[PDB]
Design a protein around this ligand. Structure first.
Ligand SMILES: O=P(O)(O)O[C@H]1[C@H](OP(=O)(O)O)[C@@H](OP(=O)(O)O)[C@H](OP(=O)(O)O)[C@@H](OP(=O)(O)O)[C@H]1OP(=O)(O)O
Ligand SMILES: *P(=O)(O)OC[C@H]1O[C@@H](n2cnc3c(N)ncnc32)[C@H](O)[C@@H]1O
Lengths: 76, 987, 291, 76
């Protein structure tokens, strides 16, 4: 089951996941190629942020769907 | 002048800055939207800007324009002329002109070719079509932009001709990768170093250099095909030599060509941009409804009347007719049409502000081509405000004859009345703060005489560079409190505003004045801070008072918005932030590989040499009054802290200018000559490892000693700055003429340079100084400096740049200019007005969502990056459920209570907790000061102590809050966290 | 038998607390003892951190009993009576090392965000920043360990809040840095292991280290013991006086065997003279030590 | 004669050894208990890293003692 994530600044990543896979492992499999801590990244899908512990079936995430990664800012 | 565009240069660049000059842009229509876009563009600093309006000022416009006054309304001036004076006050470097030439179908468009971009506001659609057709047919084509706002709806259109060229897709700097292995295969394979994945995408371009073995690849360009996170594919390499080592690759950017459409062609299938994936189909319906409204306005030469049901039916029929005509034939949202009909003639300020910010950014993209422009439509709206309103009465939306008629038509009188009674608290008066104040003034927040009050605190004084982004101040306001200047500027806009301004800085120490009752009196808190620690502190403070909290942050073309509501959402501390990384110490000290390494090394050396040592010297010599006393104590063997360093510094104290010059020469020689020799001596070049790999392999780069030479401008600047710093630090006066190259050359003509290769010596030198009368009280004083980035004459930046370039050349790495090094050293945050304005609009928009007590679903959080450009909206985090044991659970908003008495003891507290909440704790700490831990010795008897004596509180506080924990159900586990408990000393 | 008595006595002084900072009515913090990060402690006035308290509370139970304790080497720890974010740790040089019966005090601070970040570690007994006792060490007491450094490296070589513990950090130190051949802790020179040049370099390094540690590890401590560890120091050295003297004489005999060399003769003679000078005073310092 | 052990993950392993057990044996022996590679199998008892050839009673270790694990060095 193929899935894509597009973070800001135009970066798009290709991921392989399975529906019963839970969210903490979902965010874990991106660290092997990006290095960001799983607790350091926020993931968004169709306007609902993915809470820890659930799985893709909970959020009805299908093949070739697009999720995004976001970060907070500090400057003012 | 960099003193005005320091921040802007980082965002744009020098070449884009040059293209920014010699620019002319035409504007039509100075409504609220036109006013704010002109303000933003003037803040940008375009050489020449032309504005136009044929209308006249009216009293109703006072609620939409913050520069108009009663006199202009009385005099019925043309809106183009009544403001032309004020706009010039922002930037004298900007030439501004007004016009009032009537516009119609037969008006000649030839004169418009003078400019290069045109933006239209409040214009009839067919004439816009004609203008776009004319402009797009120009050679070169002239950029066209259209935008409008009606009620709670806005429309954005763009056209840069059939073909456009962009010189930078993203603006993010290319990264650098190092080569671990290369395979002479068809196609070739290159392996990334251990760890550090290349993080690339197939199709990108790159260049190489400094390759051993495969030297023919140096200076060439390939296209990649990523295979693994640590490997990829390149062109055929079978024809070259074997890969020995080395090799540095960096991405190569490429310009991209985009395409557009005519307005009319786009009208049959607008290419909108999705900003919310919950309803991706909504923008098509919004476009259809906007088209139907335009058709109605054309047909009846008027806007629909609020509550006029027949107009609603006619507009719905028109929308049905248009929707089927569309290429895709979308559905019809009757609610959308009904709401648009209800508030067609309204006007909302924050939405206009955000639209203006994004439009100004698009104008910058048009004039520079720096980022990817939007293609080719955009629609923003805030229907959630009226979504929870149900079915209101049109009577509440009727105007009463005040400046708040438009907003009353937008939302209803009662909501506005609630806005005028709000006590709001704001922290920080940065760039976002001024926009906040302007929006509040336009919204009439807190204008009620009975109630409604604003509090702002900032210790900062006005700075020259800040005026580029902060508009509420003026050049003649330099070195003045920000709060009072901002308050006066806001009060000038609207007299009814009641503002409280302070010079205070929020921090744990000042918590006394900002006591809990102060927070409770306030209704909501807004943050515009630049550091995360203040965010955490304010969030923790407001958590104790259960008040809504709002936060936003910005950097360049990126920003984020957060909303916090008690009992419903999570806190800021519920999520972490990426901490700043630090390079391994050994790399900075010995083997730098990046320019920033040398920059930080120079900064740290400056700090050590000019702050730490003088401070230690002064502290040591204020500890002991008599140097002879110190010598006697040393001779008797008494240990003294830091004695050797300070005595070495004292023995090496210069006396005159030439001594300072010699000291600078010696320090230069040690810094940039001897270290390389010692490193080579300890580590020869040819030494290998156990695997045989050479010690001087990448990323490590062998250094090289470099000989002194006065002829070098780098040498000259370095020595001049060092001598000035030494003279200042030792409080020895000098003359500027001494800095002449000839005089310094004469000074250095008689100085030798040493070659390259305890308590008794220190005592001897101290006694020699004593007998030489070098131990006076004035000698036991030492100047201490502080780093300054805004001072253009202290030479700190010059010295740091010279040192960084010198150390870079030590390891033969490319140097950097003044401004890049200045930004890197100062951690300067690039910023621009467009993003700040847009995020301010978003915050102001959600402010009324907070005010109305809307349900959880209405609130949205926004993340955006105008560089792409891209905008995303989400629903905020729901508060999470946290259980402990026996089904007992709590959230972040929980806090338990205990009422004690004068003789209350610890066992009493423990038993009372066990009874009231059913479970007995295991640990108590007041913040970070621990009060009882059974593990620590002697804590058992602490159960029999008065809480007043054990805590020692302040008399003003009638209670205290403590941290608690409970034993886990199974041993070997962490104590289960619990909500903090507020103990009361009495009833 | 003597080792048994030593272990039994030192067991009771394994862990304890002390009063290091007091407050007046204004809340100002007065340091009764010398500390390295007083500025950071004063600046970090926020008590927002709470998970750190739970983590330290869980840790202290393990720290009360699980500390290593043997005649060869041991560790000691002191903490504040009220605060728990500050800690002084004393380490002794293990047996069969150039650090035999040394004494080394380290300042450790715990950041507010702990355990999200590794705690701060520094050495205070550096002889006034004069001596570099180890390739991974520095005159200022800083240390080269990637495990503490939050840099790219490896995921296994980072401070993981879920797994890494400060006690394991202490355990890492002894047989990794405090080794019998610290000259071979420097990368690149282990390549020349087995060559006579490396042997001579290691010998010179060892003599330098031995004289440095006899200077700044016993005499300085007995003359000016830190108040938190005065009694520990005195009770240690008193029960070890004869053994320490014998091993010191053994080192003195050992070093002089290379004085006949030419490549390193001058350094060896310098080290021998210094060591004899230190031992002369150390003898009487021992003889005057009460029980 | 088993002996207790405290590893990085904190679990207290206590497996039967013999007085003549040489560390070459345990290098392979403890491999799969956590998958820890032999090079990363860096241990200390009596605060001292051990040597493969020697046996337990060579260091005169007692029965059911406790030693600890450490990982590979890497500098600044
Ligand atoms: O005080 P620091 O910033 O730590 O710099 C010191 C200092 O050099 P400066 O006085 O030029 O700053 C030492 O000299 P002294 O003050 O002790 O006389 C010098 O010692 P050397 O003269 O032996 O070089 C040492 O260099 P090193 O650590 O190589 O011995 C160097 O350290 P950095 O240049 O790395 O800061
Ligand atoms: P940018 O610098 O434009 O905006 C930040 C402004 O906030 C002020 N500020 C920072 N930190 C504080 C605290 N703790 N209290 C009050 N004001 C603060 C800066 O001075 C900027 O004006």
């Amino acid at each position: 089951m193929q899935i894509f994530v597009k973070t800001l600044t135009g970066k798009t990543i290709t991921l392989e996941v399975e529906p019963s896979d839970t969210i903490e492992n979902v965010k874990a499999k991106i660290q092997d190629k990006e290095g960001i801590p799983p607790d350091q990244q926020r993931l968004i899908f169709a306007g609902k942020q993915l809470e820890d512990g659930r799985t893709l079936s909970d959020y009805n995430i299908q093949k070739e769907s697009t999720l995004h990664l976001v970060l907070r800012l500090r400057g003012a | 002048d960099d003193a005005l565009y320091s921040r802007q240069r980082y965002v744009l660049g020098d070449t884009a800055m040059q293209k920014m000059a010699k620019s002319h842009v035409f504007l039509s229509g100075m409504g609220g939207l036109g006013l704010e876009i002109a303000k933003n563009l003037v803040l940008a600093g375009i050489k020449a800007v032309t504005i136009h309006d044929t209308e006249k000022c009216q009293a109703w416009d006072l609620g939409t324009n913050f520069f108009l006054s009663e006199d202009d309304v009385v005099n019925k001036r043309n809106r183009a002329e009544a403001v032309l004076k004020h706009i010039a006050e922002l930037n004298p470097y900007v030439h501004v002109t007004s016009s009032s030439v009537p516009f119609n179908e037969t008006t000649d468009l030839s004169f418009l070719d003078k400019y290069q971009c045109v933006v239209l506001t409040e214009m009839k659609l067919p004439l816009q079509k004609k203008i776009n057709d004319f402009c797009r047919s120009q050679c070169p084509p002239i950029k066209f932009i259209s935008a409008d706002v009606h009620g709670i709806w806005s429309r954005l259109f763009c056209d840069f001709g059939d073909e456009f060229e962009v010189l930078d897709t993203t603006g993010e700097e290319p990264k650098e990768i190092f080569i671990s292995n290369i395979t002479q295969a068809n196609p070739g394979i290159v392996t990334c170093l251990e760890n550090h994945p290349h993080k690339l995408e197939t199709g990108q371009f790159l260049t190489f250099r400094e390759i051993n073995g495969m030297t023919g690849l140096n200076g060439s360009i390939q296209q990649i095909t990523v295979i693994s996170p640590f490997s990829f594919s390149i062109g055929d390499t079978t024809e070259l030599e074997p890969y020995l080592h080395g090799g540095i690759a960096v991405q190569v950017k490429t310009p991209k060509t985009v395409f557009f459409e005519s307005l009319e062609r786009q009208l049959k299938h607008p290419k909108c941009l999705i900003v919310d994936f919950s309803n991706p189909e909504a923008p098509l319906e919004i476009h259809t409804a906007m088209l139907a409204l335009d058709q109605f306005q054309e047909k009846y030469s008027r806007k629909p009347n609020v509550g006029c049901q027949q107009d609603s039916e006619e507009l719905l029929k028109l929308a049905t007719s248009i929707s089927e005509t569309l290429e895709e034939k979308p559905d019809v949202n009757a609610d959308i049409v009904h709401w648009l009909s209800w508030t067609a003639q309204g006007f909302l300020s924050p939405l206009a502000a955000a639209v203006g910010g994004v439009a100004s950014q698009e104008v910058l993209k048009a004039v520079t081509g720096k980022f990817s422009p939007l293609c080719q439509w955009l629609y923003l709206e805030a229907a959630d405000i009226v979504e929870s309103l149900g079915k209101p009465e049109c009577e509440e939306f009727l105007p009463r004859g005040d400046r708040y008629d438009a907003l009353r038509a937008c939302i209803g009188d009662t909501l506005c009345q609630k806005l005028q009674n709000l006590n709001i608290f704001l922290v920080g008066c940065g760039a976002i703060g001024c926009e906040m104040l302007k929006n509040f003034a336009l919204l009439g927040v807190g204008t009620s005489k009975e109630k409604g009050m604003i509090t702002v605190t900032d210790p900062d004084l006005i700075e020259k560079s800040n005026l580029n982004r902060q508009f509420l101040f003026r050049p003649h306001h330099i070195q003045k409190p920000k709060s009072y200047t901002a308050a006066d500027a806001t009060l000038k806009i609207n007299s009814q505003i009641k503002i409280d301004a302070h010079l205070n800085k929020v921090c744990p120490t000042t918590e006394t004045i900002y006591n809990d009752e102060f927070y409770t009196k306030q209704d909501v808190i807004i943050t515009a801070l630049d550091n995360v620690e203040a965010r955490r502190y304010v969030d923790s403070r407001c958590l104790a008072n259960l008040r809504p909290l709002l936060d936003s942050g910005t950097m360049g073309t990126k920003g984020h918005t957060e909303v916090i509501v008690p009992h419903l959402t999570e806190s800021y501390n519920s999520h972490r932030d990426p901490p700043e990384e630090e390079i391994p110490f050994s790399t900075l000290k010995s083997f730098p590989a990046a320019i920033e390494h040398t920059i930080q090394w120079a900064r740290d050396k400056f700090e050590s040499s000019f702050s730490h040592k003088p401070s230690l010297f002064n502290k040591f010599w204020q500890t002991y009054s008599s140097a002879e006393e110190v010598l006697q104590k040393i001779q008797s063997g008494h240990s003294l802290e830091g004695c050797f360093q300070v005595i070495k510094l004292l023995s090496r104290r210069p006396r005159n200018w030439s001594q300072c010059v010699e000291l600078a020469r010696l320090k230069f020689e040690k810094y940039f000559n001897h270290k390389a020799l010692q490193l080579l001596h300890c580590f020869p070049l040819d030494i290998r490892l156990k695997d045989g790999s050479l010690f001087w392999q990448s990323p490590k780069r062998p250094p090289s000693p470099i000989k002194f030479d006065l002829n070098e401008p780098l040498h000259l600047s370095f020595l001049q700055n060092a001598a000035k710093l030494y003279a200042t630090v030792y409080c020895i006066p000098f003359a500027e003429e001494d800095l002449s190259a000839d005089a310094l050359l004469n000074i250095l003509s008689e100085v030798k340079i040493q070659e390259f290769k305890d308590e008794r010596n220190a005592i001897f030198q101290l006694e020699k100084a004593i007998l030489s009368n070098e131990a006076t009280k004035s000698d036991l004083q030492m100047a201490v400096l502080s780093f300054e980035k805004d001072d253009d004459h202290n030479g700190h930046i010059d010295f740091i740049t010279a040192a960084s370039n010198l150390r870079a050349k030590m390891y033969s790495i490319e140097p950097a200019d003044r401004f890049k090094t200045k930004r890197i050293a100062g951690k300067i945050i690039p910023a621009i007005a467009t993003t700040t304005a847009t995020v301010s609009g978003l915050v102001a928009l959600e402010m009324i969502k907070v005010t109305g007590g809307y349900p959880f679903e209405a609130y949205k959080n926004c993340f955006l990056n105008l560089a792409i450009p891209i905008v995303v909206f989400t629903e905020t985090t729901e508060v999470r459920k946290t259980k402990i044991r026996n089904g007992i659970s709590f959230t972040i908003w929980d806090r338990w209570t205990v009422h004690g008495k004068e003789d209350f003891t610890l066992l009493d507290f423990i038993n009372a907790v066990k009874e009231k909440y059913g479970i007995e704790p295991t640990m108590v700490v007041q913040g970070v000061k621990m009060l009882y831990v059974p593990v620590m010795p002697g804590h058992a008897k602490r159960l029999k102590l008065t809480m007043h004596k054990l805590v020692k509180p302040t008399t003003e506080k009638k209670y205290v809050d403590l941290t608690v924990s409970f034993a886990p159900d199974i041993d070997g586990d962490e104590d289960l966290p619990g909500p903090p408990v507020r103990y009361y000393f009495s009833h | 038998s003597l080792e048994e008595k030593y272990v039994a006595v030192m067991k009771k002084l394994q862990f304890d607390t002390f009063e290091m900072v007091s407050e007046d009515e204004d809340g100002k913090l007065g340091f009764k003892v010398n500390y390295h990060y007083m500025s950071q402690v004063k600046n970090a006035n926020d008590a927002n951190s709470a998970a750190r308290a739970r983590r330290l509370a869980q840790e202290a139970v393990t720290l009360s009993t699980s500390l290593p304790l043997s005649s060869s080497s041991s560790v000691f720890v002191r903490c504040d009576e009220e605060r728990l974010d500050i800690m002084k740790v004393l380490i002794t040089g293990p047996a069969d090392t150039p650090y035999a019966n040394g004494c080394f005090e380290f300042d450790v601070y715990f950041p507010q965000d702990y355990p999200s970040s590794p705690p701060l570690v520094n050495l205070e007994t550096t002889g006034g920043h004069s001596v570099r006792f180890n390739p991974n060490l520095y005159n200022d007491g800083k240390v080269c360990l990637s495990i503490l450094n939050t840099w790219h490296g490896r995921p296994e070589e980072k401070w993981n809040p879920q797994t890494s513990s400060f006690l394991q950090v202490l355990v890492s130190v002894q047989s990794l840095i405090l080794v019998a051949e610290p000259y071979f802790n420097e990368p690149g020179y282990e390549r020349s292991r087995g060559t006579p040049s490396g042997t001579q370099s290691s010998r010179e390094y060892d003599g330098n280290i031995r004289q440095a540690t006899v200077k700044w590890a016993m005499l300085e401590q007995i003359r000016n013991p830190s108040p938190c560890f005065k009694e520990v120091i005195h009770k240690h050295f008193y029960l070890k006086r004869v053994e320490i003297m014998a091993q010191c004489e053994e080192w003195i005999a050992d070093i002089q065997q290379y004085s006949s060399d030419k490549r390193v003769g001058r350094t060896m003679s310098h080290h021998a003279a210094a060591l004899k000078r230190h031992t002369a005073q150390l003898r009487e310092e021992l003889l005057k030590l009460p029980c």
